Structures are given as structure tokens and as C-alpha cells.
């Protein structure tokens, strides 16, 4: 009996291990008695480290006989789940692809593993081919009665119902982290030591942080549950009749109806059987164009695969996805295939909740630093305890002092201070209309090294504009200039006149209807009508000699003929006219070949290759027509024998301010790529116009030369687009084949083949070189972003559709551009709809990163200075007073820390990135030198004060510490002079922020604190003298204290700018030259260097 298994859930990530255990009933008693005895510490310690809990309670057993299982993933986060068993009696094949009895299963992250007995394993994905699907006769007659019920036990309900959790569960999963336990212990220590005010302050700030984080999490999870909760009402063929049911009672096999008008959205992944349908797949592709779907023939059942997760075109022509609108339908039924989380939209939603560890190592490294500091504080506690039992002091004093020395070294207000930079950045972003939801992501904005991009909604207007109109004259059968405008059309001549005929076509060849003074109807007609500027069974001309027209009848656009016609009669002419507009491919089989110019085919190829959509117009004259002829003669006589007029052209025109933002991003050493769902010819042209691809480079793309994507052993040919002769060395490395710049533009079908059957090195080179990525579903967007991240990139995204959701959530920083169905996952949410909020986010990220690092260094220095002062004082059982602590802790550190995080970022993207890690050498090395300088200054001040003739030595006191010394006061003033100047020196400045001379609050706060301290030193009033427990000093010694404080500033400044970085580089070079361990480099750098050098080699 097997009792372990390993699986890979996601596309490539999520390696998990499942094991099965049993409760000992003795370890459980030990655990409960231990919890009772310790009052609650065992519960905490066995919730933080469940490995020992399992080792204490669990006893290993095989899978067949089990009661709960443990699932451990690649990030080492264990979990306890309970196996569920249900009575069930059908053949094994009903559940997979014998007899099955128990039907054991486990649910993990909405995946549902089932237990195969004879193979003795857990299986996640098996499509349930349900072999009845052989003929339309079988598939049309749906399942009857009881057969549904058993299905309900295997597939569950058809509802994407994520599980919400209560407030108390959030609290027990949030507060119980170890740091808050440490904070509670510190608070107990303060209140037991009569040190109230500071404890109350940090309690208030901790409570505020908890409240804001809790509200954040609750709002996020509430919002995510509204994008994935759909409820409709359909009619199903359960028992030979049509019965009305909710959308939740559907199981694979039920045949429902799609022709009814109540049904406005597809309930589940379906397949047509009769009739026809019209849907717009705005959720799978970014476009909003109407798509027509036709019934599935008897052959296509064979190739259907309910688990392929991406369907070929042969079967995609008949598949009705779930969650897509329904424009129009004909007696048409449909057969469901997948329900629940197996649906493409359901699978996307499920993959939006799977956990993924972060590559930003800031907060975790800070916590590791505090843990090392605690390891030091333990030794300090031991030494203090020995030195205190030496002096024969009382026991309460020894305990209290030795324990407060713990909270001195591990400051309980470091994490609550490390968020001020992001807290201040959020409102600047909100002022510039960008709305952030996860503040922890702001720092990540400073690490962006790549920036992906949508096309249709982001880099381009949503609709299709009108570029120009071309016409061929009958004087010479050749085309003319571009004729962008309509005024030129009105004032041009050679329905006999060509230009006026084309204007007539653009004016009255539609079926638009007027609502609210504007026009509605087919999306393409609207743009033409607006371009004309005219008005609308006759079309009224604009006031600003063009005659009006009067329509007698019209044949709308025919799905099979692919054209439309309008028979009208201008008032002037006794005879009528017929205008026909349609696609240029089937046009030649209607019009006269004499009317077709010599430029037809090559000009059509030129326009189509650049990516436009072309439509052609034609005219005809009917010498005699009346009210009886139109009803007597059909469209066949209308169409045949027309006169070619001209081409009208559409264009996906890009937003006015994109070619500048992309140029700036390229000039700031940030690469950019396009990841779109549209064609592979429009995408390349828009990338040429925008600036992603340089104006002179080539664009090689892959083609299938031997076999389609099915065969596991196929060959690829990397051809060129403009010149189909040049190729790339395929087996071989992607290099130009027997020149300076080029860019592979991979389609969306060959990319899957590359990821599957191609070596890793070719994949890496394609990732480094590829600029354009078209014809991709959301899943390929997401896993392409993950592939980018897996070679040490840090990539963002930008999009404005539910198409993009997964790529927005899986990217390091994802900026949305809308407010519906796409801002649920994206951290940020712009509202100006242009790509101008990307530089904003990057700038604020860099400023926030440098600010956070500066604050961390400042708080660490504060901790060390206080520890050194207290360690000097403890050598004689003395201590700082209970109010000097308050002054230092509350009126010097918190105000300077808050105001050090106030200045804004620069007004321009620079060309260099900030340090983005804590355990580095260039961060640690300049910190320990500052610590050394601080300690040296304090030691010098102490030695200096111990030699004056009015010195008042400390007194050892058994009941309480003595505060009125001449050795406490000197260290107090040295510390006060050091805190302010350390805050001034460690400030972030010119490169990624505003220089401190242009920001007033910081300088004002430093000045007021320094003047307060200097006045408290030089001439203090008596109440301060008897209130802070000071002692007399000669006026010649205060000047010496000021001198030490001053010279510390010079030493710290010179070290921080000049010497400390030099020492860091010196130590780094010595380590490299002595320890002979290679320096790791980011992969894409290595691949780029290999590529350029080897290309130069040829
Ligand atoms: F508008 Al798109 F992918 F083309 F969101
Ligand atoms: Mg879009």
C-alpha cells in the first residue's frame, strides 16, 4: 500500500507531495494535556510549526485506510486535509476515462483528486470521455432521470463558488504571527515597569496597522467573489421534455436549448448540435467582433478532448465557451461538456487563487535581521544577568533590567515604521488618478526591468477608424491618391461620376437606425456614417450641387454571399440605381471583369498584408423601375453585372500619446514587448508604428515545414516576413543564416509547441529575442509572463480587459486601465485610459524603495546607539531615567523617521536602478562602519567626562537604580546629538528623489529638534533640570560636548559618501580574489552576451 505521492498541479510550477496519516489517540492526549498545562503556548507553537504537530500526533498509514492527509508544496507550507468517502456503485470507467465502491477524494485549492485503487494513486485530471458520444442521434437525446444524479456525485454543481472566511479566522491567521506575541510581551514589560506612554503609543499604531490590513484583505476577497458568481435560468431536456432549471443544475451530458430569447449568456462549455449561433468572444480574445458558429458534424466528436485546455480550429468552429455574450440565435440546442472549475473561465479563476511566493525579499530579510538581533540579545541578557548577580542586587531589579535589555536591541516599532514611505506614496498616486490597493507592491515598482503590453485597448483605440478611400478612374483604369478626408470626396469628379458614386455608397449603403439623434446598428457602418457627417427611408444631406437619394428597398448583408445591396432612386433621374458593397474576394464573381482594374490583386494584397480590413463598392443604373418591379425581381438580377468603384479601408489607429511613452521607456533601459490576442499582421504593423520594433529591422517568424502541432517530432522553419528568402538557423541556434537588428515574432500556436517539444536553449533565445506575440489565449499570456520571470526578469503588465486578468495577477506589477472585471486582480487601477501611468508607477516605486532602505538603516542605527549607551551605564547598575527614554524614543526618533519619508520622486526616469536587497554587501558594509563611529564617539565622551574635577561618580543601589550622575548625563547628550545627525546623514537625496534643500518639512523638523536639544543643554529652566534628572556641568564642558557632536557629523558624512563604499568594493574584490567562488549573474544578461558575441563571430 502506497503512502506517498508527488504531483505537478500547474502548467509547470506547483510540485506538491501528498502523504497520509492516522490519529494515534495517544499523541492527541499528550497534545491536549500539554496545551492545558501551558495555558496556550503549545497551541501557538504547534500552529507556527505544524511539522512537529504531525510528528507528535500522526502515525503513517497507506492511502487505502486513512483519515487525513498532509500536502506540502515547493514553498514548504504544510496543510491538513480530511479525506471524504461516499457510497457509490458503478463501473470504474464511469469515473476514469471493474467496480468502484468508496470513491475517495480530496479537495486542495479547488483541485479535486480522486483515488484510483488498482493503480493505487491520486489522479487530478481525467476528461470523462463518456463513450456514448458517437452519433448525433445519441448526443441529441439527453440523459434521462436518475443518470443525472450519479453525475452529481462526481462533478458537483455548476457554480464557481470560492470559499469566504469569517473575521475571526482572519484574526487568528493574522495576529498570531510571532512578532505580535513579542510585541505583547514587550507591552507587558513596559506597563509592569511604569513606562506607560510609549507603550500606549505603539499599541495605538499597531492597532491601526492591524485594522487597515484586515480591511484590505476583506475588501479584496469580497470583490473577487463578485466577478465569478453567475446565475441564469435555462431549459433542459431531462426526461424527453423541456423543463426550466437554474444554471447550477447542469452536469456533462445534459442537452439544453440556446434558441430561446431569455438565455443571454452561455451557461457552460457547450457544443452545437443543430441551428446556428452568433457570439462575441470578448473574454477569450481582446476584440469585440461578432463571430458565427455552426453545428458540429458527426466527425468532430472524435477529435474532441475535454481536457486539452486549448482547442484546435477544426473543433473551435463549433464550441460555445462559458461566460460569453450571445448576440443572436436562430431550433438550436447544445450539449454541455465541462462544468464547474473545469471550464476555461473557471480554470482561469481557480488559477487566480493558487499561491505563489514572492521574489521581493525585503520584509523577509528584515525579519531575519531581527531574529539574528534576538540571538545577540540573548547573549547580552546572559552577560547582564551574571554581572547583576555579582553586585548582590535585588531580584526584581535584575529581572526587569535583564529583560528590558532585550526590548532595547529588538525594537518593537521597526516594522510599523517601515511602511511610512509606501503610505505617503499612495496618496500622491491617488492625486495623479492612479488607485493602489496593495501598498506592498509599490516597492516592487522600483525593480521593473521589462514591461509587457496589450494592444487593442491599451496601445490602440478600441474600435476601427477609417484610413482612406481609393478609387480607379474610367479615364485610365488605375487608382489615385489616398483621399483621407470627405471634403475632397465631395469636391472631386472625373452614380456615373466615380467620386460622387463612392460618396453615395458611404452615405446610403447601410441599415442604421437613429436613436437619441445618433446612429446604431452594425459597428462598421457607424464609423463610415460618422466620417461622412451626413444625416439620415432617405438620407438627408448636410447643409454645408449634391442631390439627395431615396431608398426603395435593400437586401441586407448576406452571411453566404458576403455583401449588401440597396436599390434607391435619386429624385433627378427617372431611372433608379443599385449600390452594392462587400468583400473584394467574392466580388469578381459578380461584377464585370472590364470594370476590375489591373491593380486589383496586388493592391488588395498590399492592404491586407499591412493588416487593414478592405471593403469594395460598386454601382449600377436601372433605366426603368417602379413600385411593381421591385416586388417582382429578386437579388439575383440586382447583383449581376456591376461596375467597380473603389476601396474603403479600416484601421486600428493607435492613441495619440503612445509613440512617446514607448520611446521614453526604451531610452530608460527598459525593454518592452507586445502580448496580444489579435492577428499576426496587424500586430506587427502596430509594433512598427509604435516604436517597439525599430523602423529598419527584420521580423523572422516560425512556420511548420513537415508536420502540424500534433506530431511530437516536427521541424520548424524561421522565415522572414518582408523577404521570404532569408532564414534563421533552426537543432541549431537562432542566428541569421548565410543582419544587425532583428526580432522574432512568434504566433500563438507554435509557442506551445516550442514550450513542449523544444530544447531549453532555443526557448531561452526565443524569449530574449521575441518582441511580438499574437493569437494567444489568457492561459498562454499568464504562462508566458511566468516564463519571462523564470530567467530573472521582473516584468509588469498593462491591459484593460477580462482577457488579461491572469497575466495581471501573475506579473510582478500589473496596471489595469478600466473599472470592470479587470481591476479585480490588478494591484493598480488607472483612470486616464492612456499609457502614461507606467512612468508614474516606476518613478514612485524607485523613490519608495530608496526611502524604505534608508528608514531601515536609520532604525538599526538607533537600536545600536541606545544599546551602547545602556551597556555603558549598566557597568555600575545605573540607567537612563524614565523620561530621557521617553524623550529619545518619542520626540526624536518618530518625528524624524516620519519626516525623512516625505519628499517626492524625481521628475524624469533616470538610466540606473537602486539597490533592491538587504543582505547585500553594499548595504551591510556601510552600516557597521556607522555603528563603529557612533560607539567610538560615545566612548570618547565617556572617557573625557571621567576626568573632570567636578565628576560625580555613580552609586550602586540595591533597591533601585541611581540616575543623578555625571556619567549618565554625558551619554544622554551624546546620544541626543547622534540621533539627529544620523537621521540627517542617512537621508536619500538627489538621484531618485528631491534634494533636501527643496523640501521644507524635513529641514524644519530637524532644525526644531536640534534647537530644542541645544536650549535644553545650554540654558535649561529649573523644572526641566529637576524633571529630566540632570546634574551640573561647567560651561567649558558643554562646548566640548558640542564639539564631539559636530565632529561626528563630519565623520559620518565623509564615511557615507566617500570611504564606506570604497571599503565595500575593497572587501568584495578581496573576497572574490581569495575564495574563488563565481559571481552569479542574471540569465538574460548571459544569453544576450552569448548571442551578440556569437553573431559577431559569423
Ligand atoms: F484589448 Al486586448 F488583449 F487586445 F485586452
Ligand atoms: Mg485590451
Numbering used by the authors: 203 to 299, 315 to 547, 557 to 720, 746 to 787, 791 to 798, 826 to 1011, 1023 to 1030, 1034 to 1393
What text comes from the article?
P-type ATPases form a large membrane protein superfamily that couples ATP hydrolysis to the transport of cargo across biological membranes. In human cells, P5B-ATPases execute the active export of physiologically important polyamines such as spermine from lysosomes to the cytosol, a function linked to a palette of disorders. Here we describe a series of cryo-electron microscopy structures of a yeast homolog of human ATP13A2-5, Ypk9, determined at resolutions reaching 3.4 Å, and depicting three separate transport cycle intermediates, including spermine-bound conformations.
Structural analyses to SERCA and ATP11C-CDC50A suggest the SPM-structures are indeed caught in separate E2P and E2.Pi configurations, with the E2.PiSPM structure indicating the presence of cargo is sufficient to stabilize an E2.Pi state. While the E2.Pi structures are highly similar, distinctions are identified between the two recovered E2P states (see further below). Spermine uptake is accomplished through an electronegative cleft lined by transmembrane segments 2, 4 and 6. The cleft harbors an additional, elongated density compatible with the presence of SPM. Equivalently, completion of cargo-binding is linked to the proceeding E2.Pi state, where SPM is accommodated in a cavity on the luminal side, coordinated by conserved acidic and hydrophobic residues, including the conserved VPPALP motif. As such, the composition of the cavity also allows binding of shorter physiological polyamines, e.g., SPD and putrescine, in a similar manner. Comparison of the structures reveals major rearrangements of the TM helices linked to SPM uptake. Based on these observations, we speculate that the affinity for SPM increases from the E2Pinhib to the E2P* and E2.Pi states.
